[PDB]
Amino acid sequence: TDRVSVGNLRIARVLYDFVNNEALPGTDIDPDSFWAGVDKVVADLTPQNQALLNARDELQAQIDKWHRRRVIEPIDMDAYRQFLTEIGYLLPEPDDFTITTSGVDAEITTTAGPQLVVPVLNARFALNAANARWGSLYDALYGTDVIPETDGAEKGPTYNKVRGDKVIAYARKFLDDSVPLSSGSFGDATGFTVQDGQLVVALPDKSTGLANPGQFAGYTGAAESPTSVLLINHGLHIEILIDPESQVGTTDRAGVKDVILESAITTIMDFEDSVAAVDAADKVLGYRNWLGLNKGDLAAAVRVLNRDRNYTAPGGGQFTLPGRSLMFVRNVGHLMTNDAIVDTDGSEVFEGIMDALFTGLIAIHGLKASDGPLINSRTGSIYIVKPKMHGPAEVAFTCELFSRVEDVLGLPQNTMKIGIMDEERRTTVNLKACIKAAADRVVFINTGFLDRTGDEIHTSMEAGPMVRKGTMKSQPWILAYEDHNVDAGLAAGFSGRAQVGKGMWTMTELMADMVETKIAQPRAGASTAWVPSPTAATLHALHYHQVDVAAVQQGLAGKRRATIEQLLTIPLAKELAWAPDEIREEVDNNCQSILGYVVRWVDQGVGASKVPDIHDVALMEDRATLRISSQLLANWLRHGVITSADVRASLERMAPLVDRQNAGDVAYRPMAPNFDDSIAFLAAQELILSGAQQPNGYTEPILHRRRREFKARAAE
Numbered sequence: 001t002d003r004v005s006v007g008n009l010r011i012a013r014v015l016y017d018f019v020n021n022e023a024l025p026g027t028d029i030d031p032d033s034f035w036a037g038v039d040k041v042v043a044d045l046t047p048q049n050q051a052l053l054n055a056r057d058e059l060q061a062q063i064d065k066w067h068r069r070r071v072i073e074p075i076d077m078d079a080y081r082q083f084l085t086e087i088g089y090l091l092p093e094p095d096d097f098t099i100t101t102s103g104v105d106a107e108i109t110t111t112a113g114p115q116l117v118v119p120v121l122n123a124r125f126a127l128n129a130a131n132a133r134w135g136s137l138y139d140a141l142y143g144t145d146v147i148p149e150t151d152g153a154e155k156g157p158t159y160n161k162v163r164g165d166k167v168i169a170y171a172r173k174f175l176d177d178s179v180p181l182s183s184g185s186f187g188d189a190t191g192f193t194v195q196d197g198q199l200v201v202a203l204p205d206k207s208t209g210l211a212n213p214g215q216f217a218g219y220t221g222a223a224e225s226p227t228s229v230l231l232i233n234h235g236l237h238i239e240i241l242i243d244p245e246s247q248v249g250t251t252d253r254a255g256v257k258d259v260i261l262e263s264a265i266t267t268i269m270d271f272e273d274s275v276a277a278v279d280a281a282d283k284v285l286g287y288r289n290w291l292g293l294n295k296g297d298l299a300a301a302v303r304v305l306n307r308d309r310n311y312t313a314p315g316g317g318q319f320t321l322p323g324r325s326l327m328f329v330r331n332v333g334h335l336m337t338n339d340a341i342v343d344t345d346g347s348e349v350f351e352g353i354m355d356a357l358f359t360g361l362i363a364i365h366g367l368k369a370s371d372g373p374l375i376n377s378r379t380g381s382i383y384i385v386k387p388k389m390h391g392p393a394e395v396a397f398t399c400e401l402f403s404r405v406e407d408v409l410g411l412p413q414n415t416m417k418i419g420i421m422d423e424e425r426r427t428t429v430n431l432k433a434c435i436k437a438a439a440d441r442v443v444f445i446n447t448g449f450l451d452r453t454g455d456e457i458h459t460s461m462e463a464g465p466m467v468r469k470g471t472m473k474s475q476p477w478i479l480a481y482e483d484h485n486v487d488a489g490l491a492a493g494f495s496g497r498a499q500v501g502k503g504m505w506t507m508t509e510l511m512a513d514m515v516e517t518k519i520a521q522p523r524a525g526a527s528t529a530w531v532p533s534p535t536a537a538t539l540h541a542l543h544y545h546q547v548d549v550a551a552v553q554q555g556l557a558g559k560r561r562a563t564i565e566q567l568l569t570i571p572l573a574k575e576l577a578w579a580p581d582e583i584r585e586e587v588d589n590n591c592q593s594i595l596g597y598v599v600r601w602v603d604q605g606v607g608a609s610k611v612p613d614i615h616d617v618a619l620m621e622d623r624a625t626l627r628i629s630s631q632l633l634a635n636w637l638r639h640g641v642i643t644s645a646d647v648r649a650s651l652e653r654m655a656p657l658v659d660r661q662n663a664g665d666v667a668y669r670p671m672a673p674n675f676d677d678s679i680a681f682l683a684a685q686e687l688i689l690s691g692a693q694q695p696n697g698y699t700e701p702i703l704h705r706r707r708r709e710f711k712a713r714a715a716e
């Protein structure tokens with residue numbers, strides 16, 4: 001075969017060559033030392049990794065049996081909690097402590113703003129994401145439904161000046177709200193000059209300054225005639241571009257062309273739930289993009305990474321603001337193996353261990369000058385998001401895994417920082433202990449609420465039928481879970497030190513709703529929350545201007561707003577909650593969601609994209625939504641809500657629907673009418689019917705297997 005032998009390992013040639021020829025040069029790490037380190041880290045940590053997974057199996061088995069020796073319905077909370085305690089699921093809270101993480105960048109410790117997540121396998125999206133640090137507010141307002149397409153203000157093939165005027169007025173009002181004038185309104189401004197180092201705004205009757213002069217951050221061009229004016233509010237920059245000779249500028253009363261918002265302050269380059277990668281060839285594509293990102297030289301077809309932005313300080317001197325979001329990388333979690341490396345017995349190597357070694361190695365390039373200044377962390381950290389951990393022993397393992405990798409890479413200890421996803425129940429209920437296990441590495445906690453819902457369903461699979469998917473977002477457990485996350489963070493001293501993050505808005509086209517509703521996240525003390533696109537980053541940024549996150553977090557200090565009983569309130573459906581037609585649309589909804597996502601995953605290897613749902617609402621969802629949908633259907637089938645023919649009929653009904661929605665594509669092979677000849681259709685069916693039997697309801701084992709099958713089939 002085509003592998004390279006290194007001690008006990010057999011490494012796929014593509015990955016071996018990539019590491020040697022692309023990743024290693026420039027690092028000063030000796031190739032022989034690196035590979036021997038890989039072999040030794042893998043040898044030392046593999047049995048512990050496996051034991052952690054066995055522990056999940058043991059715990060879930062005990063829970064399944066507890067429910068199966070079932071009473072007559074309502075759960076006895078005191079008994080249940082005592083049970084969780086006795087089996088080591090629910091562990092004691094450690095005493096109060098404060099995190100000690102150092103060498104973290106201001107983007108994480110201090111700045112509250114949007115956090116963008118993007119599939120690393122897509123080079124052009126990853127590039128747009130890195131550049132999303134700065135975004136046009138005019139484009140984001142004009143191009144979405146935040147400005148209502150009413151009579152007269154609708155989007156056409158050419159610019160609609162009536163709609164344009166609304167965009168302008170929306171932005172003026174934002175300016176008045178965020179950086180107030182001493183008197184008057186930006187709506188009445190006729191010009192901007194800089195005089196003796198202070199901003200002067202001409203009104204039609206007089207001139208005025210900012211109510212708070214300190215919000216004047218800089219400018220470009222001559223002071224007497226600046227091309228732009230830079231402001232700051234709540235640590236976020238706003239830049240008024242001034243150009244009377246432009247399409248929009250000629251219409252504006254002050255010659256204003258656009259308002260640019262500092263938007264995606266950080267971006268997560270994703271190797272996990274938003275990509276499909278099932279072998280070395282797939283991993284390498286991802287590693288190569290992550291490499292191009294850190295070196296500054298990634299470029300896509302049809303392009304490049306933005307340079308830093310130049311300004312003149314009011315006081316007088318040239319300075320620079322970052323032109324890119326600070327980049328995290330999301331590694332895969334502890335579950336999966338990947339044949340990119342096998343051992344001598346032919347066993348696949350743990351993929352999470354590989355990601356640490358390789359994304360860790362590659363990240364070193366972002367700590368040094370690109371060939372321009374260094375791309376990423378100026379304070380010397382590597383930021384890794386670690387998803388899907390179950391409890392504090394699993395966090396401690398990641399800690400030791402990073403420590404060992406730091407040794408192999410010749411990096412100082414604690415260089416590799418951890419963004420902890422709070423997205424599994426055993427982590428939620430032991431959160432304080434989970435943070436403590438990462439006390440000198442943690443840079444965020446985040447409520448990954450979609451995965452969290454999946455785990456909620458799987459954990460209590462045998463308890464009874466669960467409420468519908470759309471109901472989950474408002475169940476007591478999840479609300480308690482959101483508050484409990486913030487409390488634990490603030491109490492560990494995250495304020496000023498680490499991000500307290502919240503979850504993804506998935507409805508990419510429903511931007512007016514996002515602007516209206518996602519404001520609840522910073523209001524809840526979240527210093528960050530996830531957005532699916534640069535456009536969504538720009539709009540979510542509005543929320544950080546209206547909400548003083550720092551102040552909100554100070555007010556929340558010391559409070560305990562969720563009990564363990566609330567956390568443990570299983571989302572069981574009640575007596576006769578649904579009519580026949582309600583059950584049927586919930587089934588169709590889920591079968592459509594599964595099919596539309598799985599067909600692109602297995603056939604084209606796309607792990608995330610805009611997928612229209614049943615009512616054609618565009619959704620940017622990923623593997624976690626699949627986890628929920630398959631687990632819910634498995635749960636309804638398990639408890640007799642629906643029959644196996646119900647499931648079949650719905651799959652078979654929804655399948656041509658999906659073929660139609662994707663009739664546009666060219667690599668698309670239709671599932672109907674020969675369903676059993678469709679590897680994707682079979683994968684979809686398997687995720688439901690075998691769903692209850694997947695470890696913690698995870699979808700990767702079925703998905704990886706079927707994608708690999710498809711790839712193999714398309715080669716004979």
Ligand SMILES: O=C(O)/C(O)=C/C(=O)c1c[nH]c2ccccc12
Pocket residue numbers: 086
């Ligand atoms: O009485 C109780 O409340 C309680 O929980 C009893 C026990 O767990 C055990 C008693 N003998 C044992 C041997 C092995 C493992 C557990 C036990």
Ligand SMILES: O=C(O)/C(O)=C/C(=O)c1c[nH]c2ccccc12
Pocket residue numbers: 117118119270273274423447448449450451452503504506532608620621622624
């Ligand atoms: O809630 C979770 O468990 C979680 O981790 C969220 C996600 O991964 C994403 C949800 N929609 C997305 C679109 C693009 C990239 C990532 C995502």
Ligand SMILES: [Mg+2]
Pocket residue numbers: 086
């Ligand atoms: Mg006992």
Ligand SMILES: [Mg+2]
Pocket residue numbers: 273387421423448450451624
């Ligand atoms: Mg997740």
Ligand SMILES: [Mg+2]
Pocket residue numbers: 467468471573577
């Ligand atoms: Mg319901």
Ligand SMILES: [Mg+2]
Pocket residue numbers: 057060692693694695696
């Ligand atoms: Mg199981």
